[model samples]
Target: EQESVKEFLAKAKEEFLKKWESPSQNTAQLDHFDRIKTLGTGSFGRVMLVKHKETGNHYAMKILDKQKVVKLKQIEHTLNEKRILQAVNFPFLVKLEFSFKDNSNLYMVMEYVPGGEMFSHLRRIGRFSEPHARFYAAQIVLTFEYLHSLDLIYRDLKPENLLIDQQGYIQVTDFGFAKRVKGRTWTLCGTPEYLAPEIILSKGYNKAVDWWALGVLIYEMAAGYPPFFADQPIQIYEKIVSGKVRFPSHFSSDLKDLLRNLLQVDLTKRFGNLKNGVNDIKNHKWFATTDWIAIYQRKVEAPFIPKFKGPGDTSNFDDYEEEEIRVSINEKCGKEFTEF
Candidate 1:
């Protein structure tokens, strides 16, 4: 019975791969192409570092198994992520170059973030100093400002999705669940621990979600942990929906006040869009020493930096075989379809 199920899954995965040809039939043009190395792996696909053969330029290629992706029904989210990335041109957000397909998987060629994951950096350093935290936090505020201005909400904001570039600037990635805020409400989605009160109550949310997340992010940066904690999903939701702002005694009143206004339960009171939202938070005393213009241009000094393994070295990723094929019915199918 298990063997039968596995075989059926394999066949279904193959079918999904076939549909990818619809997009690839448009013809992709790359002067040169070379497989460099693998970057990381995901549940449905793996990301690798590859080079453009003609130009020798580097890009992060995300190869996702169409069958696995379709089976999960994450196609809408995947396409939305690409569309959102294409619309935003901020340095803090990961850049999407081109998207196409070779056979079994769809590929999203993206910019390579050299600094490594921000969560990993924090874990290694144990904690961040005030200046270090402020620098990153300020950068994020600017990014959130851009995102909110577009009327889009980044439902997920955590250390894992936050990357540090070689210059020590923050690089926010993963817009897989991002969507335009058409109205005041959205379906309950996002990492539970970082979820906002409105998200928990299903009252609906817009750009305010990111504000709440910014507060949670700042709290984590200051306290080295989240404000709310519980084991089960239910309890976690309860704590988030309670809408309370608790601060450690160690944090200065200035920081605490900032978090309070950011984590406000009422969306109208939130930062950025509201009169006092982003402007109010930016004017706080903690940021009084900040060089706003320099920070935006990534000219500010960094306290922590990363040592990258160079552009082509992808030894960090695990290996996997191609599992399917995509072909245009009108165009002649090559034998690469059979062997792969």
Candidate 2:
């Protein structure tokens, strides 16, 4: 028998509570954390390096302007991102510690990962050796596996969204484009370089899009650049839809084979989208030496661990000028948008 609506909502709340630990009374406000520095900025908002005033623990506080969010028609997406973060608990993914709102802004306090971004490391080294690339790729594989299990599609998969921890492991962040879709969705969202052909065609797509992005990531890491490179967005899209990626003369056959299978334009033949599913990826020769269990357990040593002065060290990150801009929130916004 189907549960009643009231009963269903109660069960949903119960499940949410089980996964989410509410913020303590003392740690529920914006003033509780001392903003130390600007971490990064984006279209939605800016993330700041903040420390708890009392405990001295550090966190990345993502502050979003409510007015901007509503104007951009992204209020629902913002809320969904918070809900998704709250529900997930994985070592490879960023963790959300607290969420609250002030009259003008919404905030998400997340675990501070001190090792900085994978994008910076990738740029510094130009490209990674096969073994080094495999180590990082394997973690992303497990991350995609877990997200798929939750019936969620992480539409955005790029190095900028991949952060390295002090322990040198990958932490996937920025859930702005993430969505829960049981079958397929038709949303033209994500970075141009990582967009799948299916997405460009406006054909309904499922989790298979993520596997395609992984192929792009692998190619970028091994070749020092993305498979499809163009100065313009439309030009990139043109190449993505019609052009084939040429492997470097030095690339191993196994690496070429893996990328080919993953980059298949036909969604039906994509590597991770096969009937055998993620097993098709785990068993690929490129990852033949990977100890899947050990990788998940974080027993494998990372190829690069950033040297930091301490937990509060910002050396791994690029410096940015600090600015304080205040926006007054209409009282109506406070009443209309009360869910954080």
Candidate 3:
């Protein structure tokens, strides 16, 4: 019986690889691309604007140091992110073309979004017009639907992680905190203001957490800031757990109602967590005018378009001091990370 079980497991693994694994020939080498400039930086690593030497096509190259990742014990998260990217493809989400590694770093070549971060636009504009907010929220709603369809939960949903493409459409980025799960997960992660009450309490949470963050995003886009704001993270967590949100006087009742339903601390009553799932959000009165079909098809006209010369445009992005780095791989860790 044990031998039979082992054979079955081996067969399942092979089937899984056949469906999800990219062929070895499809993997790219680090020498194939020329680095353009630093796009952004984070705790893990940095993303750079790179162009294919042969095709001259612009791509965002995300570089992560294997040593840093292993030290942080993020191996599972890193692999899971690559797996999720490889398994899914959508117009509203950033596309990953190639994932490869060198002696010291893991590299991901993704579609470069020249329009820059939605956070910067929101900061510059202060608040979006209702139509603009509706347009962005509509795109996100579709993305949420797609993610949930694959049993994936985007634990992090905020303007900072949302990018605008050259075509003026929003593209979801950053999958480090995203996880594939069914039912409830116990992990406590996500931004403070965006954290759901269940997450703060360390209770098991599900995709409902994304809806809560969406509510915060909608409020932030409609108003100048998030519903709950505090200087300290502890205070922010207090406010979130209390489930209290106040709208500015300028907000319409329909808009207020939509936000209220989405921010409901009761997971069972949350808009996206309902029996109808994303349909509950799509059918909301605030989105009554949204042509979801057109939104998904990228036919909906964006209310605001970033001015850019072309795909190579970096005008929309913030300037970063470029620095050169030399890499030295630790051979001990190198052997274990060959799959990267």
Candidate 4:
């Protein structure tokens, strides 16, 4: 019975969970790197690609402005993001390598994952074959399982937030919406297309919402478009609440059935949230042949390796010409944020 399943847990705890030690937030100053270009613009800050002066290594540096953070009252979330990154390290999740702060800004030096957003790749490739979608969907399930073990909830899950690495494996990025939750959390945030019906109904939600998003992600991966979509966000929300998943002609019966269990608006029936929990989804017929240990160790081959020249390649990311690299925002913000 579940022999490898139990062993996989013991192995991952020793191998992955014990390797991370949180770094000093203030010691590693910002001048240690040379800013190259903006990778993407976030709500409060723009992520930049930088070259480390000492090692000549490329890293993504996320600089957050304290003024905006305080103005928008996201100081808690700002610190929460850093804290979660500080506490976690996993193969399929992005890692924060270093962090420091200026009077007006905060900085996090993160590993530069070269593959662009999975959203772009999906759009370009149209849709994934069943095997390809299963590979990624299973990895996502592993991620959610690991996070739940820590009593954490990943409220955000979408293709744009997922970065494919050179190995074509998923590296989930952007922890701004993640939270440590032992109980239900009430927050009206998350992309519209992927919002769970529970979230749309304004009821408090737990980790199960993520399982709901998993179904949406799998559907989008298989169908080339999300199951519920519209030109407007409101329309998308309405469609999601409408609780209908119209399967495309290409979906196999097993995958469709899996999605049916995962996408259930009724919390009691959701696959991962049930009494057997993630294990039910783990042993789902759709993934019956998956070598859980091989997936955990990344021993299996990835379906699509991203094309890039070298470690410093930014070909995968979109260019942000208008955004400033060193846009000055004052200095030194430690006094107010002892939480950092």
Task: Give lDDT tens digits, candidate 1, residues 1-340.
Answer: 2475347445643543354223222133332456666666767777767788767778877666666667777666666665566556676888877776544556677887766777777777766777888998999887876666566688899888887877888888888778766678567778887888888887767788888888888888767777787788898788777777578788888888888877787778776557655667777887898876688888888877677786554332335563323433342222322212
Off by over 4 Å in 2: 1-27, 325-332
lDDT of 2 by residue, 179-237 (tens): 87889998788999999999999999999999999999999999989998899999999
What local lDDT does model 4 show for residue 197?
88
How many backbone collisions does model 3 have? 0
Once fitted onto the true fold, the runs of candidate 1 whose alpha carbons sit more than 4 angstroms away are 1-33, 313-340
User: Per-residue lDDT of 1-340 in model 4, one digit per residue for the tens?
Assistant: 3776667556754543443344346747777888888899866787999999999999988888887778777787777778778777678989888887766678888899988899989999999998999999989999998888766788889999999998888998888888878889888878989899899899999999999999999999999999998999889988888768799988999999999999998987898999999988988999987887798799989989999898889898897765654535555445667757
* Ranking of predictions according to lDDT: 2, 4, 3, 1
lDDT of 3 by residue, 1-340 (tens): 2475347445644543554566332478788989899989877778999999999999998888787888877777777777777667677889888988766777878999999999999999999988899999999987887777667898989999899986789999888878878788987778888888999999989999999999999999999799888999999988988877889999988899999999999999999998877878988999989987788888877888888899999998888889664356544356656555
Clashing pairs in 1: 32-52, 32-53, 32-54, 33-53, 185-204, 185-205, 271-277, 272-277, 272-278
Q: How many angstroms is residue 336 displaced in model 3 relative to the true structure, after the best TM-score fit? A: 5.0
The TM-score of predicted model 3 comes to 0.91
RMSD to truth, every model: 12.2, 5.4, 6.6, 2.5
lDDT-superior candidate, 1 or 4? 4
Query: In model 3, which runs have C-alpha deviations exceeding 4 angstroms?
Result: 1-26, 329-332, 335-338
